[PDB]
Amino acid sequence: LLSKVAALSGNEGDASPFTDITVEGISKLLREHGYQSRGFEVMYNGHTG
Amino acid sequence: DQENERNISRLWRAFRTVKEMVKDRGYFITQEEVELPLEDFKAKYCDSMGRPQRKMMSFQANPTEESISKFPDMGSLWVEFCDEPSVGVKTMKTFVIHIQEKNFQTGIFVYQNNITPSAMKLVPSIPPATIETFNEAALVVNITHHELVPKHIRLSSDEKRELLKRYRLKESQLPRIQRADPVALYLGLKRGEVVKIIRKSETSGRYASYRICM
Amino acid sequence: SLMSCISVGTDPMPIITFLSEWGMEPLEDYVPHQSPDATRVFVNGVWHGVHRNPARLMETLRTLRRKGDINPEVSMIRDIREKELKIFTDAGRVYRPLFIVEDDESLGHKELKVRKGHIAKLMATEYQDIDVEEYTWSSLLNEGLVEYIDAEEEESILIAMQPEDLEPAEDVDPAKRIRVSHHATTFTHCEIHPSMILGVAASIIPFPDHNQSPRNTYQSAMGKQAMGVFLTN
Amino acid sequence: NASPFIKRDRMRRNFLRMRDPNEYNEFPLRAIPKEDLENMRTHLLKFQSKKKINPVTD
Amino acid sequence: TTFRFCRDCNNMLYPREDKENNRLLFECRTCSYVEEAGSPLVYRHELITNIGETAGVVQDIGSDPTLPRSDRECPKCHSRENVFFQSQQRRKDTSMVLFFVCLSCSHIFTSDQKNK
Amino acid sequence: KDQDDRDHFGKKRLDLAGPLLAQLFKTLFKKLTKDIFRYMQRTVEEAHD
Amino acid sequence: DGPTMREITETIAEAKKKVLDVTKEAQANLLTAKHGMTLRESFEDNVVRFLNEARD
Amino acid sequence: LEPGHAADQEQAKLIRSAIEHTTLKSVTIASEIYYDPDPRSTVIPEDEEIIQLHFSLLSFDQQSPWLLRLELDRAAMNDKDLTMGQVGERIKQTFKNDLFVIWSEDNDEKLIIRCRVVRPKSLDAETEAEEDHMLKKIENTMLENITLRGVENIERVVMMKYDRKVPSPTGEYVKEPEWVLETDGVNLSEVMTVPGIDPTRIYTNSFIDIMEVLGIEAGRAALYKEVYNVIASDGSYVNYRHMALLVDVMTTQGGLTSVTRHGFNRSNTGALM
Amino acid sequence: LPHFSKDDYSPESKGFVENSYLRGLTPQEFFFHAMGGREGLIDTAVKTAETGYIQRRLVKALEDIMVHYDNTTRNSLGNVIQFIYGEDGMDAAHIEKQSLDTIGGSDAAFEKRYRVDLLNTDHTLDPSLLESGSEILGDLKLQVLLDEEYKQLVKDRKFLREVFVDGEANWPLPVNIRRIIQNAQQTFHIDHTKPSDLTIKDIVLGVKDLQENLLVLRGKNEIIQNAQRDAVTLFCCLLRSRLATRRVLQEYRLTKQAFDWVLSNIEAQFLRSVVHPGEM
Ligand SMILES: [Zn+2]
Ligand SMILES: [Zn+2]
């Protein structure tokens, strides 16, 4: 989830163990980029489409 | 006088257990005397002051008719309860003389504390008669009544011969049971004597096993 | 660990002579019954004497170490309950740095001696290389802002995990983890950062505090088995 | 609720951009001449006992 | 129990009986020095002992930073500052009672409410 | 007082290359010094230069 | 969801308070050790059980 | 417990105490050696009444002047149901007639026992030096090798309530609670004889004691039970025959042969094997 | 840790992780959680070595034990370990857990399910269960057969309770009789309404003769015959309980063709479950 936001925002994620970073905070940034907050995406089967 | 009552209760239980041992070995013992009430025991095996007399407790047992047919070699059995705690050579010497005098095939000796080595070494001294020593404390509770202990039945010479013949075995190929085994001592097994152990199996209900004394 | 260092040891004699000049009574004239309150002074496990006012000696000894007269690697422990003062100078002891916390009654509560002014010059020297006066880790150590502490000396100090909440005298975001303040007003040191407890291999794991402990151990082993660029030559 | 990025590549530039009365009786003290301190050794004698040991009388 | 020491050689005295007066004497074993005992007790073996409950209390106990603080009232000077600790006996049979030491009068009190 | 804990890291010491080499050099130097004197005894007794 | 987390938080908080309650009485010496156990072992058992149930 | 008193809790305490091993060391705080010149008056304020009680109610000429005193905990003697009468007489029979002992009543504020060693007709001049040493020596023994009651090698006993399914008078199986005693330490031969217990149901964790008390077949059943518990402790289930075959092999020679190099490997099955 | 005060017994001090993995662990919780994990890793390594040695010892002790063609379990020396493998002579691969319907239940339930009477009207058999129900009432020859069956069932209940003191009824047994009955009902499409053509005499004799075909030992002497009877005592109890006169006519409603089919399967299934000689 952090890497997805970092790639979209062109930043380097802060994955240090003990910090104020939370999943909800990362989720808010991800939703601001037009993606589902929890990282789920709608995909299509490659064999049948 | 609480200790006096405790000793009487222990002695009564030991006497009750010894009766079962004689009865199970194949001797004519009636169930009535086996289940002798405690008050009746005090009325017959005590005196005015209360403390019991071990000498009067000694009795004689004879093989029952059924046992004779299966084992036509069993003789009389004499059970003696020693009075004084320390069993010395003198008491043992007269005890062994007592058995040999009246042609007692087997003699059971019940002591309180211990038998000294010089008395014990005299135990194998009157063949073919057999002498067995039992401690009073060990006889207070009958181990055979324990749920874990299965039923042991001694096999006759004919039965043992058929057992080996049908299974085509040898005496060394059978399971072994130690002579000093508490159950073996209870039944008075001898070398080469096989016992049928009929125990309850959770897979087949009843299972019969054989052990040869070693 | 990342910040762990191992001492090289120095001569203990200079410390022993200092103790004698500051009231360390020789052990040859020690009568236990005529002074049943003296503190036993130990240097490298050798009982060199007793001293009547252990508070003043410890304050003087600590001050000298902080300013730089005594080597920082020298470890000093005062067991108040046991009435023993132990000084260790031998090599092989493992120690790590920590912040120093002092009263500083200007704000009325204990606080780190290091301030934003110091951090300003720490970064100034860091970025000027890529010319202000040099200001390195040694300068902090000589200014009494950081202190080397080993396991033996860890026994007689109180350490605050973070200065954000533990040092200040004393809605909440539901996503944030539950933190214990411990409500202690006698802190003597402060961790540089809790994340420094980990080693080289464990420092590459992202969010190792969100993983089960066995998983962190396994990754440390597999990281050493990963293809990469060990050297540019 | 926080910033999940290690902001770099412009914070380095950012930091680089902003940058008594006579109530006493004192006697004179002088050293012993060396003419009598040669070939002579002065030592300290310490009796280890709980009594008062005095060789003059005891 | 109190140990006694000889006067002439510092060796420790041992009990002795005098049938002439039926009394207790403490006599040295080397130099023949005697002294009448002030008490008739000569031996004690406390199987359950409470000695060492507050061992380690010194004039500067409050200077220890690792000790916890509490707001309990001192029932000798009416002060709220104090440092408390558990029993110092390491036998695995002691209670978890806390001993409180006041920083204003050096008075030691306990939180026990069963026996005190 | 409880028996001292043997796992206490404060009672442990780590020997690095310095101390490790010091003991090796100390042992080897002792052998060298012993060999030197053995030469002196041999040289003196056997009348050799 | 938020309501569940609030309930979870209070469940742990209540257990912590209960652990505190047993601790105070143990410090007061009014706690009687369970049969066949010492004062400290009995106190530890009470705390451990309370915390395990809180997680469950 | 006995089938007629399995559900009763009062009988559990009696038997539990009757088997638990307790020593004078566990019910005493301190032992003191005093010097009372005469065995007629006391120096302690507390015992000024006990001597006046026993002496008035009632030889003492040859009693040693050195006194041996014990302080005992009432809370220790009420956790286990004991009275000073039991404790006092126990010391009396420890030394049949060679010391006089006086014990205070329960109503007294502090429980105390006074003991004096009575000297013989002959007078020994060398024993005076070690007279107090002799008191300490007997004092130590009276703390260690004294069995107030119970069975040796039984550290402690704890009671629990198990549920056993027994047929109902109607004919169905209904579970009812019973009182069971769990013990630390094993003395199978002695405990089995203690009155009040059901000797036909006593079980021992160590199948070694079962083998030497009940028999090899009893040991075989006990050995299987222990193996079954260990495998079933983790929840795994293994068919009965697999466990039985291993147990039978371990007991086919009349004794408990181990699975180590000193057991099955000492048989006569070929050197190559 | 050097972060709390001395003599601290709070849950946080002694290693209670109040957070979750999603929320993260505090530095104190992280170390304590790591300490617990190290215990598992050490235990896993040491336990693997200890268990491997134990496994090797067990195999070497029992490597020479095999089931011979006389159904006896013997080692290399020929010494007898078990006179019959597993005390029943069956293969573990053919054992399934089944419930003994006689041991459990109350006495009243036992009578209502097994007792069948043709003289009285308290436990009478409904005439619509079989085509001969009209003429079966008042027949003494069939009544004694039912009486013999019932007493055998009562003996089984007494024996089973004496074997299993706890009263548990679910125990492993070779042949799954319940599945065989289900197959018979569906294979032959039992009407479940029309009375069956089975007779009381056929059912009682059919089950009795089936017990004789359950052969584990085939010796023709008294000793082997006695062992054969004991080896199938528990299985016969299950067989009689399931194949009871009332249960067959009432609970299962089996037809004569179905009943014969069921008996043949039990005989075939039982013979297939016997231990194969030569098994290690
Ligand atoms: Zn002296
Ligand atoms: Zn105060």
Curated annotation (Swiss-Prot), chain D:
Modification after translation (UniProt): Phosphorylated on Ser and other residues by TAF1 and casein kinase II-like kinases.
Localisation per UniProt entry: Nucleus
Described function: TFIIF is a general transcription initiation factor that binds to RNA polymerase II. Its functions include the recruitment of RNA polymerase II to the promoter bound DNA-TBP-TFIIB complex, decreasing the affinity of RNA polymerase II for non-specific DNA, allowing for the subsequent recruitment of TFIIE and TFIIH, and facilitating RNA polymerase II elongation.
Subunit structure: TFIIF is composed of three different subunits: TFG1/RAP74, TFG2/RAP30 and TAF14.
Other known facts: Present with 1920 molecules/cell in log phase SD medium.
Record-stated family: Belongs to the TFIIF alpha subunit family.
Protein name: Transcription initiation factor IIF subunit alpha
Organism: Saccharomyces cerevisiae (strain ATCC 204508 / S288c)
Lineage of the organism: Eukaryota, Fungi, Dikarya, Ascomycota, Saccharomycotina
Entire protein: shown range: 17 to 132 of 735
Curated annotation (Swiss-Prot), chain F:
Subcellular location per the Swiss-Prot or TrEMBL entry: Nucleus
Subunit structure: Component of the RNA polymerase II (Pol II) complex consisting of 12 subunits.
Note: The binding of ribonucleoside triphosphate to the RNA polymerase II transcribing complex probably involves a two-step mechanism. The initial binding seems to occur at the entry (E) site and involves a magnesium ion coordinated by three conserved aspartate residues of the two largest RNA Pol II subunits.
Family the entry assigns: Belongs to the RNA polymerase beta chain family.
Described purpose of this protein according to its UniProt entry: DNA-dependent RNA polymerase catalyzes the transcription of DNA into RNA using the four ribonucleoside triphosphates as substrates. Second largest component of RNA polymerases II which synthesizes mRNA precursors and many functional non-coding RNAs. Proposed to contribute to the polymerase catalytic activity and forms the polymerase active center together with the largest subunit. Pol II is the central component of the basal RNA polymerase II transcription machinery.
Protein name per Swiss-Prot or TrEMBL: DNA-directed RNA polymerase II subunit RPB2
Organism: Saccharomyces cerevisiae (strain ATCC 204508 / S288c)
The organism's taxonomic lineage, starting at the top: Eukaryota, Fungi, Dikarya, Ascomycota, Saccharomycotina
Coverage span on the entire protein: 393 to 441 of 1224
Swiss-Prot record, chain G:
Gene: RPO21
Taxonomic lineage: Eukaryota, Fungi, Dikarya, Ascomycota, Saccharomycotina
Post-translational modification (record): The tandem 7 residues repeats in the C-terminal domain (CTD) can be highly phosphorylated. The phosphorylation activates Pol II. Phosphorylation occurs mainly at residues 'Ser-2' and 'Ser-5' of the heptapeptide repeat. The phosphorylated form of Pol II appears to carry, on average, one phosphate per repeat. The phosphorylation state is believed to result from the balanced action of site-specific CTD kinases and phosphatases, and a 'CTD code' that specifies the position of Pol II within the transcription cycle has been proposed.
Protein family (similarity comment): Belongs to the RNA polymerase beta' chain family.
Record's subcellular location: Nucleus
Cross-link (Glycyl lysine isopeptide (Lys-Gly) (interchain with G-Cter in ubiquitin)): K24
Note: Mutagenesis experiments demonstrate that the minimum viable CTD contains eight consensus Y-S-P-T-S-P-[A-S-N-G] heptapeptide repeats. Identical and simultaneous substitutions in a number of consecutive repeats are lethal: 'Ser-2' -> 'Ala-2' (14 repeats), 'Ser-5' -> 'Ala-5' (15 repeats), '2-Ser-Pro-Thr-Ser-5'-> '2-Ala-Pro-Thr-Ala-5' (10 repeats), 'Ser-2'-> 'Glu-2' (15 repeats), 'Ser-5' -> 'Glu-5' (12 repeats), '2-Ser-Pro-3' -> '2-Pro-Ser-3' (15 repeats) and 'Tyr-1' -> 'Phe-1' (12 repeats).
Protein name: DNA-directed RNA polymerase II subunit RPB1
Complete-protein stretch covered: 672 to 727 of 1733
Superkingdom, taxonomy of origin: Eukaryota
From Swiss-Prot, chain I:
Location of the protein in the cell: Nucleus
Quaternary structure (record): Component of the RNA polymerase II (Pol II) complex consisting of 12 subunits. Interacts with DEF1; the interaction is direct and serves to bridge RPB1 to the Elongin complex in a DNA-damaged dependent manner. Interacts with the Elongin subunit ELA1. Interacts with the Elongin subunit ELC1. Interacts with ASK10. Interacts with ESS1. Interacts with RTT103. Interacts with SHE2.
Section of the entire sequence shown: 784 to 1063 of 1733
Sequence segments annotated as region (Bridging helix): 27-39
Protein family membership: Belongs to the RNA polymerase beta' chain family.
Further remark: Mutagenesis experiments demonstrate that the minimum viable CTD contains eight consensus Y-S-P-T-S-P-[A-S-N-G] heptapeptide repeats. Identical and simultaneous substitutions in a number of consecutive repeats are lethal: 'Ser-2' -> 'Ala-2' (14 repeats), 'Ser-5' -> 'Ala-5' (15 repeats), '2-Ser-Pro-Thr-Ser-5'-> '2-Ala-Pro-Thr-Ala-5' (10 repeats), 'Ser-2'-> 'Glu-2' (15 repeats), 'Ser-5' -> 'Glu-5' (12 repeats), '2-Ser-Pro-3' -> '2-Pro-Ser-3' (15 repeats) and 'Tyr-1' -> 'Phe-1' (12 repeats).
Comment text on domains: The C-terminal domain (CTD) serves as a platform for assembly of factors that regulate transcription initiation, elongation, termination and mRNA processing.
Name of protein: DNA-directed RNA polymerase II subunit RPB1
Originating organism: Saccharomyces cerevisiae (strain ATCC 204508 / S288c) (Baker's yeast)
